[PDB]
Design a protein around this ligand. Structure first.
Ligand SMILES: [Mn+2]
Ligand SMILES: [Mn+2]
Ligand SMILES: [Mn+2]
Ligand SMILES: [Mn+2]
Length: 1348
């Protein structure tokens, strides 16, 4: 065959002129690797194999390093007529084969707007091209392949000898390496082909197989050759509506080989040698070079309009983590960066959350954060959308084969599936990422793509789609990261289900492959880390593996100390290991003959035949990681030694990644790199991180550059940075370190300066989050008063106040004349007021207060929810607001204060000053509320003046600010029957919180204070899905069932309703109103499936809140005094059956009214207030009385029935023991006559009046004696029953027991002391009763009382 030679300094490649084929590679040393030794001239186009003849190919040697081929590819019958241009180039030990041009003689190209290109060239390949091959006739001929596996128990690798029996045909792999006759090679291709995988729960580029292995007979030997899998060129796709499109290539077809000798110099030639060479030709994920610097990964979360984490708070948190890690690199994923938060506004990528501070604050956070080595990225979704999103349209909607919506998940709103193919082919998604690019410029590091590969956008989401998705992202300068462990093998640098080891179990983690991890460990956080309960790959991997925790609200995670502890336990050593590239990996226990890995490398002269990995950097530094034993039953299987240039830098067992068992690992890791591009730092900046799991004393050999030092400087790392400095002597290049358990230390050669941190930049105050330690109360905040101010809490630090104290700070950078809202988180445990005040000079611009906090925090993503223990195992943190105009003098000051001298605490956190246009609060002259209006158009955050209640416990609450996007958010679009927005752009929305039987949301006194005794007109616009499913709740103090006044609301589905009521302020100033979920089932109107959710039959929308104080009729002192008499005359006699707290509330109220009435110099205003407070007290006591009368009537009913359980349930729920009806019959009377001994004894123990009588003068003893209940009569006399008690006739329980003729009951009561002299109105004794009836048996016991 006629050939030509391409030359480099490393090899000579003999190539055929009749086809782009290699005959052989001859290296400088004379070693040879074969190409395609046979006459194979096949080209596949659209699945049709065409064999080329001599006249179908033209050749041209361009230079000594390049040749060009022109391929005439025609099949008239199969509609193929193409001209393919192939380039072969050589450099060093690499050969590249590129398709540089594709000409189609059967088309004019792709029609405008990605229209269908008829006879388009969709696929292209060179079947059995064998660019590199090995033969069974060669010394140590072998194949090594890798396929995708997310399963910890199933490796993705194959390792086998190439023999005469080896028979393969287009066997597809992610990676493929052939070795033989002292040379090795891997084949790289940019093919987007999807094929064979070991294990993956999703698509989304998990199945990308780019190499094809095929055997052929090469004379008397079997030859195994490598070819590229097919490439896509102009691919024709169909969307959910049946519309077809043709989309151009992501890139032109490209492939390469890199010929290796014994690269790691270990005396053998295998895939590892090929893998070292392969790194020079392989694709590298965009920005994969920064991956080793990303030590601190975490999520900063925002959800449901709450603004739990505004961008400038996230920046303070970056500075806290920077101090605690001594400036290690960070990667913060902003989950809910856009619109109203997480799983809101998808897919509006360019809509940055206005309530977080918008694009302005996001850019400030990214720009400033980068100075601390912190990278930022956003969570996006390209599979699900909500009606509120501006991108929402009929074209975007994914539809099923029947024409209906492809529904997603319902939570805040109903998610609808995005038509993935439409989104790509129309240029829609690329334009939405462009919207984001305009907002962030070049400040943002990465994109985090959620759910991609789970088939929500289409049944495909293949490697071709994922390749195009990753390109749109990389094109904007963004690093690619995604959700699923197996997803996007080609371009992703991080998988959430790989780095967060807790999710999905052992079958759904990161990439379980020795080949993939050997090649790319340093480029991704997509592997298997320690999580021993999964076993296999997850049991102490030598390379570690990212273990991700959070503290900023993601899944309620708000534990900072655990976050930091975990960074040092797993992530510091994982990241240190990623600064080196794998060069050798022997004795892998996961690979056996049974799982298809008989030829896997097994050296008994390395680490006793146990697992070992060697890694190297471009500076010749060597890292060696060794496993103690390859037996999982041995204690040494989890033992790992790490050496750096032959010196031990880490030893022992890590604390289990699943949090199940603490370890003993200690390390002294040299951190030689900067937190930016990872370049080597200078000598004065070189440092060592020290960690000791169990704590104690360890001795280490310092690195070579430290061997002549006399001493080192050791600093303990905290949330304040470098503390407790120690000078440690160096003897013979060694150091002894004493360490507390699980405590980070940093070692320097000399004195090291503290990292400079200016807290709360752009926040208008210094240290708004109280992160500056105790010192913050000295030069940032000024403290005054007899009381005390402390920075308290070992997690999220807060300001704690006790006694009479004020904490002040000057406000900076305010725009003169502009409107601002200032809010602060407040938890008040004191009865004394806690306040927030803005002053200019001395003048008060705005002020607000809270008494004892009455509402617990149920916001899961928030830093101080009721699961975080602010004090006493609870948290009452709620945002307290002030609205003011920035003064013209530019002098403004905030003051946080506690007024009373009591010892109870008040907590404050997160002082937020934000530009805000809300102006719906009007006051009276005395500073009390005149009116409050809200259309929710200018809310700084949350559902203010309401606060979320406990209907779902601590949750990502299904309550938020709904957004207008007509016609989609309106009633009538699809199966939707309710409007999301009543008027304007925003309303308050509740999604499906039906049949809870509890409070959903409520006002609190710090948001809307209802003055004691004052009357208010409350009105709002609403939309409710069904009749009586939701109600208006009115209460005083902390919500409690039974104490609440409920008004059921009627159905207002698609048509806005009006709600109006009057509210009278409770005596303690703690009155409130809200929305309550009843027990009543919604009317789903015959809807099925998602239509029950989307319809709105179970939802509640509120808007246009209006609260107005109603003027009261003026009262005199006489009127108020008389009202005191009336109230006392009604309730003074009702102390017995009334709670000890209810009697206290009543007494406190009477005291309050008397103080107003009797003050020297009291006015009409005081007399009106005193009278009104008593009127409010009356209605409160009366409502409580009807609820007690309800319980009493049910207790008298259960006394008759005889059920102890329902008698005890009612008594425990507050039932009156001595409760009598219209005829004066108590439950002790009823239980005694029926004879329920278990109830009689329960009632007597509870304090029931044993002497109690009805309108007939009958006591429970009279009733029990006539009925003849011996056991009941016994216990009554033992509890103090009146033995000689009489009725309206004069019958003692002796007379009645004789009338009924009870032989055993008469004798029992006589023994105790029942009178025999007793006579009724007729003057009849027991002598007359015994002689009247036909039985003389009674006359025998009476003649044994007195003998006649
Ligand atoms: Mn080797
Ligand atoms: Mn804080
Ligand atoms: Mn509105
Ligand atoms: Mn919404």
């Amino acid at each position: 065959v006629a050939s030509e030679t391409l030359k480099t300094k490393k090899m000579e490649v003999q190539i055929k002129k009749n086809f782009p084929s290699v005959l052989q590679y001859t290296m400088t040393d004379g070693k040879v690797m074969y190409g395609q030794s046979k006459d194979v001239r096949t080209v596949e186009i659209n699945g049709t194999n065409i064999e080329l003849g001599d006249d179908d190919v033209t050749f041209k040697k361009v230079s000594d390093t390049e040749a060009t081929y022109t391929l005439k590819v025609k099949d008239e019958a199969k509609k193929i007529d193409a001209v393919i241009t192939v380039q072969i180039t050589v450099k060093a030990n690499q050969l590249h084969l590129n398709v540089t041009k594709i000409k189609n003689n059967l088309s004019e190209g792709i029609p405008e707007g990605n229209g269908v290109e008829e006879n388009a060239i969709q696929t292209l390949s060179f079947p059995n091209q064998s660019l590199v091959s090995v033969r069974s006739s060669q010394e140590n001929a072998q194949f090594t392949g890798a396929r995708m596996s997310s399963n910890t128990q199933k490796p993705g690798d194959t390792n086998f000898a190439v023999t005469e029996d080896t028979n393969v045909t287009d066997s597809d792999y992610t990676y493929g390496f052939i070795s033989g006759a002292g040379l090795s090679a891997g084949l790289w291709s940019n093919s987007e082909h999807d094929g064979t995988y070991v294990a993956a729960p999703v698509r989304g580029g998990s199945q990308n197989t780019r190499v094809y292995a095929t055997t052929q007979q090469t004379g008397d030997a079997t030859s195994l050759g490598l070819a590229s899998a097919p490439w896509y060129y102009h691919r024709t796709v169909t969307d959910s509506k049946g519309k077809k499109y043709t989309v151009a290539e992501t890139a032109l077809p490209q492939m390469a080989v890199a010929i290796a000798g014994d690269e790691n110099e270990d005396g053998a030639v295998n895939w590892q040698d090929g893998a070292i060479a392969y790194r020079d030709i392989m694709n590298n994920p965009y920005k994969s070079e920064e991956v080793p610097e990303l030590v601190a990964w975490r999520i900063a979360m925002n959800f449901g309009s709450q603004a739990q984490n505004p961008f400038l708070t996230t920046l303070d948190n970056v500075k806290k983590v920077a101090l605690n890690t001594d400036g290690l690199g960070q990667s913060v994923l902003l989950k809910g960066y856009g619109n109203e938060g997480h799983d809101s506004g998808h897919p509006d990528y360019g809509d940055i959350g206005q309530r977080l501070g918008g694009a302005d604050d996001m850019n400030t956070m990214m720009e400033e954060g980068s100075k601390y080595g912190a990278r930022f990225g956003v969570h996006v979704n390209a599979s699900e959308m909500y009606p509120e999103a501006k991108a929402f349209s009929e074209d975007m909607v994914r539809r099923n084969s029947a024409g209906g919506l492809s529904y997603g998940w319902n939570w805040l709103d109903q998610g609808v599936g995005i038509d993935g193919i439409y989104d790509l082919a129309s240029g829609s998604r690329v334009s939405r990422f462009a919207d984001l690019s305009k907002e962030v410029g070049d400040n943002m590091d990465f994109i985090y793509l959620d759910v991609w590969g789970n088939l929500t956008s289409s049944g495909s989401e293949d490697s071709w789609e994922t390749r195009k998705m990753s390109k749109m992202i990389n094109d904007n300068g963004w690093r690619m990261t995604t959700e699923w462990g197996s997803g996007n093998e080609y371009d992703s640098t991080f998988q959430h289900w790989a780095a967060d080891l807790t999710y999905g179990g052992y079958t759904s983690k990161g990439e379980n492959s020795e080949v993939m991890r050997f090649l790319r460990n340093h480029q991704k956080d997509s592997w298997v880390g320690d999580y021993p309960q999964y076993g296999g790959a997850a049991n102490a991997p030598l390379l570690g593996g990212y273990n991700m925790k959070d503290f900023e609200g993601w899944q309620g995670r708000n534990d900072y100390a655990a976050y930091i502890k975990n960074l040092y336990t797993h992530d510091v050593s994982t990241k240190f290991i990623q600064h080196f590239k794998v060069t050798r990996w022997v004795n892998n226990p996961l690979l056996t003959a049974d799982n298809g890995n008989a030829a896997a490398v097994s050296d008994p002269n390395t680490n006793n035949g146990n697992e070992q990995i060697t890694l190297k950097d471009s500076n010749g530094n060597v890292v060696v990681v060794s496993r103690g034993s390859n037996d999982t039953s041995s204690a040494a299987y989890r033992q790992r030694t790490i050496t750096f240039n032959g010196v031990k830098v880490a030893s022992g067992v890590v604390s289990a990644g699943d949090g199940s068992a603490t370890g003993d690992e200690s390390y002294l890791l040299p951190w030689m790199w900067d937190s930016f591009t990872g370049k080597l730092v200078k000598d004065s900046e070189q440092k060592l991180y020290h960690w000791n799991t169990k704590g104690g004393t360890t001795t280490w050999t310092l690195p070579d550059s430290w061997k002549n030092l006399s001493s080192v400087k050791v600093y303990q790392l905290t949330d304040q940075g470098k503390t407790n400095c120690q000078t440690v002597a160096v003897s013979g290049g060694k150091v002894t370190l004493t360490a507390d358990a699980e405590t980070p230390y940093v070692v320097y050669k000399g004195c090291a300066k503290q990292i400079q941190v200016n807290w709360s930049e752009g926040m208008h105050v210094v240290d708004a989050g109280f992160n500056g330690g105790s010192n913050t109360l000295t030069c940032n905040w000024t403290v005054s008063g007899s009381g005390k101010a402390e920075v308290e809490g070992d997690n999220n630090a807060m300001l704690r106040l006790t006694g009479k104290v004020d904490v002040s700070q000057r406000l900076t950078d305010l725009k003169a004349g502009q409107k601002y809202a200032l809010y602060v988180g407040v938890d008040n445990r004191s009865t004394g007021d806690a306040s927030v005040t803005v002053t200019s000079g001395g003048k008060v611009l705005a002020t607000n207060s809270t008494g004892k906090s009455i509402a617990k925090n149920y916001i899961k993503a928030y830093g101080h929810n009721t699961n975080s223990n602010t004090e006493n195992g609870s948290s009452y943190f709620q945002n307290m607001y002030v609205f003011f105009t920035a003064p013209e003098n530019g002098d403004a000051t905030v003051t946080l204060s506690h007024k009373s001298t009591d010892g109870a605490h008040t907590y404050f956190d997160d002082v937020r000053i934000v530009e805000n246009q809300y102006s719906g609060i009007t006051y009276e002259k005395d500073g009390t509320l005149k009116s409050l209006t809200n259309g929710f158009e200018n809310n700084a955050q949350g559902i203010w003046p309401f606060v979320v209640s406990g209907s779902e416990g601590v949750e990502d609450n299904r309550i938020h600010l709904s957004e207008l996007h007509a016609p989609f958010t309106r009633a009538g679009w699809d199966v939707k029957k309710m409007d999301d927005v009543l008027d304007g752009t925003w309303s308050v929305k509740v999604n499906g919180l039906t049949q809870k039987g509890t409070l959903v949301y409520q006002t609190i006194p710090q948001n809307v204070k209802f003055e004691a005794g004052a009357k208010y007109k409350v009105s709002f616009d609403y939309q409710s899905g069904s009749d009586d499913i939701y109600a208006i709740a009115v209460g005083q103090g902390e919500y409690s069932a039974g104490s609440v006044k409920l008004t059921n609301l009627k159905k207002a589905l698609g048509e806005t309703g009006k709600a109006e009521f009057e509210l009278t302020g409770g005596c303690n100033g703690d009155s409130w109103f809200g929305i309550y979920s009843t027990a009543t089932a919604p009317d789903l109107q015959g809807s099925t499936g998602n239509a029950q959710d989307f319809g709105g039959y179970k939802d509640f929308v509120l808007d246009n809140l209006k609260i107005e104080r109603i003027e009261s009729q003026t009262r005199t002192k006489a009127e108020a005094q008389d009202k005191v008499k009336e109230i006392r005359g009604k309730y003074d006699s009702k102390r017995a059956c009334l709670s000890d707290a209810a009697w206290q509330q009543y007494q406190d109220c009477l005291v309050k009214a008397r103080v107003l009435i009797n003050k020297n110099g009291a006015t009409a205003e005081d007399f009106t207030k005193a009278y009104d407070i008593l009127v409010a007290l009356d209605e409160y006591m009366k409502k409580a009385e009807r609820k007690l009368k309800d319980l009493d009537r049910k207790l008298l009913e259960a006394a008759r029935a005889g059920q102890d359980d329902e008698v005890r349930i009612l008594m425990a729920n507050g039932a009156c023991v001595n409760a009598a009806d219209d005829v004066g019959v108590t439950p002790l009377h009823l239980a005694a006559q029926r004879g329920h001994l278990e109830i009689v004894e329960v009632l007597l123990k509870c304090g029931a009046d044993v002497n109690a009588a009805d309108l007939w003068g009958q006591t429970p003893l009279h009733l029990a004696a006539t009925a003849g209940h011996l056991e009941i009569v016994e216990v009554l006399l033992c509890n103090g029953a009146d033995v000689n008690a009489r009725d309206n006739i004069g019958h003692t329980p002796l007379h009645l027991a004789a009338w009924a003729g009870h032989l055993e009951i008469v004798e029992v009561l006589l023994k105790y002391g029942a009178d025999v002299c007793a006579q009724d109105k007729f003057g009849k004794t027991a002598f007359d009763i015994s002689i009247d009836n036909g039985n003389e048996d009674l006359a025998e016991i009476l003649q044994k009382a007195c003998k006649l």
